[PDB]
């Protein structure tokens, strides 16, 4: 899909925080909260160069 | 509070009747997966929204 991996809203926390600066999911009282959102490295997330049609 | 409304007393009543465990005869069914009731609620921890 072209929307896969991007259906979330996630912005990096930034420097400080002792975290790896990848975007992270916003707030929430759930498992998927500040968990790493985009990028091929992250769980969930988008694959590298999504295959097109 | 104790000065409820009707729409709210009725919504709390529904939230009272949804708060009971699965009948034990219901996971001897055939096409069954529900081990227990996971949608339960405790008045102390989770606060019903509202």
């Amino acid at each position: 899909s072209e929307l896969a991996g991007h259906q979330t809203s996630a912005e990096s926390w930034g420097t400080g925080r002792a975290v790896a600066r990848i975007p992270r999911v916003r707030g929430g009282g759930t498992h998927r909260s500040g968990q790493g959102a985009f990028g091929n490295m992250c769980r969930g997330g988008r694959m590298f160069a999504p295959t097109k049609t | 509070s104790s000065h409820k409304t009707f729409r709210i007393k009725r919504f709390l009543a529904k939230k009272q009747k949804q708060n009971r465990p699965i009948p034990q005869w219901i996971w001897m069914k055939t096409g069954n997966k529900i081990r227990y009731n996971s949608k339960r609620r405790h008045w102390r921890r989770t606060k019903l929204g509202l």
Binding site: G16, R17, G29, G34 | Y36, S38, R40
Partner: peptide
């Protein structure tokens, strides 16, 4: 007739608190 167990949920805690009280000013 095999009886059953139980289960209770709870909100998932998220670690985001940062006091940042410490200050090291050295100009």
């Amino acid at each position: 007739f095999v009886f059953g167990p139980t289960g209770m949920p709870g909100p998932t805690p998220s670690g985001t608190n940062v006091g940042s009280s410490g200050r090291s000013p050295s100009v």
